[PDB]
Amino acid sequence: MLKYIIPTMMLMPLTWLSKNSMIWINTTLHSLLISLTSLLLLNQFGDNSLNFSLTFFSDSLSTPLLILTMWLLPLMLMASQHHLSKENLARKKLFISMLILLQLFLIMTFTATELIFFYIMFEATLVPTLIIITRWGNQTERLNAGLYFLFYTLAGSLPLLVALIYIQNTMGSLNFLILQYWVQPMPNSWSNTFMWLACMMAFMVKMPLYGLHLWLPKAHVEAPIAGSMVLAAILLKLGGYGMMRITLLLNPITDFMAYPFIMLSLWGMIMTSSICLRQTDLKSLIAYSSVSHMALVIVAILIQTPWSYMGATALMIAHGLTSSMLFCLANSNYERVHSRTMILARGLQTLLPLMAAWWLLASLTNLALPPSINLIGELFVVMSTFSWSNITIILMGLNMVITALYSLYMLITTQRGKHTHHINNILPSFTRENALMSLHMLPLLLLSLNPKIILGPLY
Amino acid sequence: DAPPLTLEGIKDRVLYVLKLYDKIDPEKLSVNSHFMKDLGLDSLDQVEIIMAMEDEFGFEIPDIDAEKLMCPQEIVDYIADKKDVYE
Amino acid sequence: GKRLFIIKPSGFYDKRFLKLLRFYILLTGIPVVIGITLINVFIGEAELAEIPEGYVPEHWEYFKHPISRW
Amino acid sequence: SWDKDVYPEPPRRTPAPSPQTSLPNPITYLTKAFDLLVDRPVTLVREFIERQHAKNKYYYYHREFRRVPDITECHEKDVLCMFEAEMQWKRDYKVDQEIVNIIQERLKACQQREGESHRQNCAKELQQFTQVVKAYQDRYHDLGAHYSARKCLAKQKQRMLAERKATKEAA
Amino acid sequence: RDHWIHVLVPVGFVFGYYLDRKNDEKLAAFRNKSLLYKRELKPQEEVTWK
Amino acid sequence: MNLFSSLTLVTLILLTMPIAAINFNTHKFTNYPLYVKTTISCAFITSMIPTMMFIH
Amino acid sequence: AFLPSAAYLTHQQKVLQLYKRALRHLESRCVHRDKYRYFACLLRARFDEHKNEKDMVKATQLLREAEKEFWHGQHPQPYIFPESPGGTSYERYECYKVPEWCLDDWHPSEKAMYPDYFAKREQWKKLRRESWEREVKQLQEETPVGGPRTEALPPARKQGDLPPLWWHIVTRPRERP
Amino acid sequence: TLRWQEDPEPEDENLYEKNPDSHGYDKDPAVDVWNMRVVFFFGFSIVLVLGSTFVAYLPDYRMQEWARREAERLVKYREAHGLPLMESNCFDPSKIQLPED
């Protein structure tokens, strides 16, 4: 895993010694080279995972997340170079360094075999994200959003540290392979109940769970575009990955202890979806859609069946790609019209036809159109939850309506109808925005051809 | 489909349907003939004339503009404005 | 005659992007397709056989297609 | 080609065409045109490709795994032997999944081949499918997403305990 | 050199790649000792893998 | 058997060909609707053949 | 009750609007033309019977009773002209009505295909920017203090100038572009 | 009311005015074209196409098809000696010591 950490940490001299006019070109070129290099993690075996040393390993669950992260960094570099065009050079280099540090922390978080190292860099991912949100956010409410995000995460995740140190003192090790071969059942006691709660609540907050999701429609809105990409495409999936890793040790208490939380998502993904029917804000609409999809992921993890696990992996990857693309489209509209409200700019298909095509395709992939991997993940979670209980299909099917009921709604008021008369600064679409949309979307449709590389470690 | 219109064509149309009215003498009216001033018509007769205009040209004139057209040339000007004639 | 002016947004930039994307995809798509066809026509796939006695194979000799072996 | 013992198929019985009219059917003419315009160039190209492949020959082999002692002869919390036992168990699990897949493919092939007499002519395939599904369900079901050899051993021990107790009740 | 900086990321890969190979030399305690792959050494083969 | 499957999947591939033809376009197409209509009529013939085979 | 020219609707205007909608609904119920003519002349006689009414409250009571009559006698789906609101092809071509300022964003390569049109566009923009300050200075000196009391706009008063706020009502897109 | 010294908000810049051939990456035309070329070359023709070729030719991912081949051995054994096609026990019941009760 040293072959990816070292070039990522050498990206900082690359971005700090470059000229004032070629930082973007050099950083995008070398991050695309690292994304190409990332494909050597597909050497997965049907029985054994890929173990590199005592410190790092990568099974078939971490590999799609690593490839997605190192593919996502150049996309952020291309997106965040227009609202920072007038910025000072030193602050531009500091922003690029924050992005590089965030990628380095993420790609060594996804590969740590030891759990306290995973916790340490899982919380080291807080600092660059928070700095980006509270520094390069636009309006006044970025400070409150940063406070909410940081304090929800830390107040949920300090008992996780306490529980992990207790595990290290009790079992004797925190290596994931040793814990895979030394796992003991957890009996029925109040101590084990709070053990389960301390292990679960950090990832509950970072998923987010309904009722603990109040930091999402702030931090996903006040942040800049690259902050929106990392907020919607990696960190939520990082919480899901941690949940998948740590649910191994919490058997068989989970078989009843997951009983409330499933309801807190099974109803929750209804309510937040209904919020998208009556949202006056485009970015808030995308954030609440992310809440609903990740609640579906929560249910899939908590019922702990194989089909649900592969559905959760495919759903996480597909939702990350789709949410990043939707945030890019909303940011392009916000750059053109200088307001975030959805009803201000209407009828943009008459002026911007190809961006309307990208909008249509992104909305179609949002509402789980087959044979996309969004539909594959949603379908597999549906099969597993039907095996769990029958009436759950109702809670699925109604959601299958409401999702489309906002997605096409998001397609209409932003693209269809009569255009706004007084808005006359609708410039034609740049090559950069179209290239960003294509680089977001074409990997998703190509992954629809060969989905078996994202179907989890038990495929 | 949809043959083009012209100003003298639509003027011929409105005059042609106007001389088919039993309340109007065809040998007196002109293109600046007021209805209740030069022809001694009624407001209800003006309403019937506007409905004849709508049934002739296939599009409905709104009431707030129907209460303002008082001469055949005004109807010609309104139809010309609404149909974008003589490009 | 009597042709009018049809007012439409500038489609030059979108068409330019599509031309550039198709060109940059094809610029390496044609060599890789030619390479796969030349691999499959001349070199071809492997043939399954039992392991000879006293002979152990390499790991990359356990696969069929030349590109997978490479 | 494939092996016919693993994938069985009955010898086909094709009736002879004995027409009763004088109108020529277009199927025979179109078939003759099909081996004229389509089959001959395709077979010539395949012959050229086969000659080029016979010019350069090389082989590949099916990987063989020796038997390592299973989890029943592994000391507890001794990762060195349990790792090998779990790897063997996972390889066996994948092999059994493909065996059940083969039997399902056999059943579907029997149903499609028999057509309108499938519920009588495919009794043996249905019985084989039921047997392999019963054994798979008794071997691998209700383990969870975190399945391992120890959970399978515990399930088997519980099943044998229940069977022995039920035998003892009726003895 | 005007553009020497463009060697910073590739060679940092290669050296880093080399480092991983060195780690394999520290993890060869069971080389040709696993029960699944225990096999007598071929002639002119000092190790099974490097 | 070989004529059957080949002609049916030819009908399907012939139907999906003009989608690629318009998606890989650069110029103004010389009456693309005529191309689509001709393609669908030819696919109708190509699917009429195995229907006749099934009838026989 | 919502007009750009008048604040309210007079009694005669209400009676005329009622006659218009009643005749339209009767034409809807009476599809054949001769039957429609019979009942349209009957409705004309019924409206002409109470034409010379001088008591205002009696006219208002008759108007309210006629409104109740009309609401009892509507067609559930009356005839709407295709381009009127509620019609089959109402606002159908609004996807084709591209505003003209998009022509400012055209590339010079595609602007070279229409030289004379863009020369005329340049002279039109020159005329607009020459007359805009005259239009606004006419607007300040015409309306009384406290803001305009009506939405009606003044015309071009002097010679050689243009009416105020004319650009978006002259350069509006055609019905069928 | 007197207020503090502050620059007014600058007007929104259009990249198509000073550069009608702009790709939207930078104000400098040469830097613009080189950034577009770098993005289109290393994104589409280096990672996307070669990555699809790599994933399409992965060497027997997760041993998957190998198991199919092994099944084509095992049934071929177990249909030839009259053995049951599948046993209901994963391990040998002889070598399992049940607790007495």
UniProtKB/Swiss-Prot annotation, chain A:
Keyword NAD on entry: yes
Superkingdom of the source species: Eukaryota
Assigned keywords, A-Z: Electron transport, Membrane, Mitochondrion, Mitochondrion inner membrane, NAD, Respiratory chain, Translocase, Transmembrane, Transmembrane helix, Transport, Ubiquinone
GO BP terms, alphabetized: electron transport coupled proton transport; mitochondrial electron transport, NADH to ubiquinone; mitochondrial respiratory chain complex I assembly
Subcellular location: Mitochondrion inner membrane
Transmembrane regions: 22-42, 60-80, 98-118, 147-167, 196-216, 224-244, 256-276, 284-303, 308-330, 351-371, 391-411
An example molecular function term from Gene Ontology annotations: NADH dehydrogenase (ubiquinone) activity
Recorded catalytic activity of this chain's protein: a ubiquinone + NADH + 5 H(+)(in) = a ubiquinol + NAD(+) + 4 H(+)(out)
E.C. designation(s): 7.1.1.2
GO cellular component: mitochondrial inner membrane; respiratory chain complex I
Membrane topology per record: Multi-pass membrane protein
Biological function: Core subunit of the mitochondrial membrane respiratory chain NADH dehydrogenase (Complex I) which catalyzes electron transfer from NADH through the respiratory chain, using ubiquinone as an electron acceptor. Essential for the catalytic activity and assembly of complex I.
Binding partners and assembly: Core subunit of respiratory chain NADH dehydrogenase (Complex I) which is composed of 45 different subunits.
Family note: Belongs to the complex I subunit 4 family.
Matches recorded under PANTHER family: NADH-UBIQUINONE OXIDOREDUCTASE CHAIN 4
Protein name, as recorded: NADH-ubiquinone oxidoreductase chain 4
Organism: Ovis aries
Gene: MT-ND4
From Swiss-Prot, chain F:
Coiled coil start-end: none
Entry superkingdom: Eukaryota
Entry's localization field: Mitochondrion inner membrane
Regions that span the bilayer: 4-24, 43-56
The protein's role, per its UniProt record: Core subunit of the mitochondrial membrane respiratory chain NADH dehydrogenase (Complex I) which catalyzes electron transfer from NADH through the respiratory chain, using ubiquinone as an electron acceptor. Essential for the catalytic activity and assembly of complex I.
Family of this protein: Belongs to the complex I subunit 5 family.
Assembly, per entry: Core subunit of respiratory chain NADH dehydrogenase (Complex I) which is composed of 45 different subunits.
Protein name, UniProt field: NADH-ubiquinone oxidoreductase chain 5
Species annotation: Ovis aries
Shown chain mapped onto the complete sequence: 1 to 56 of 606
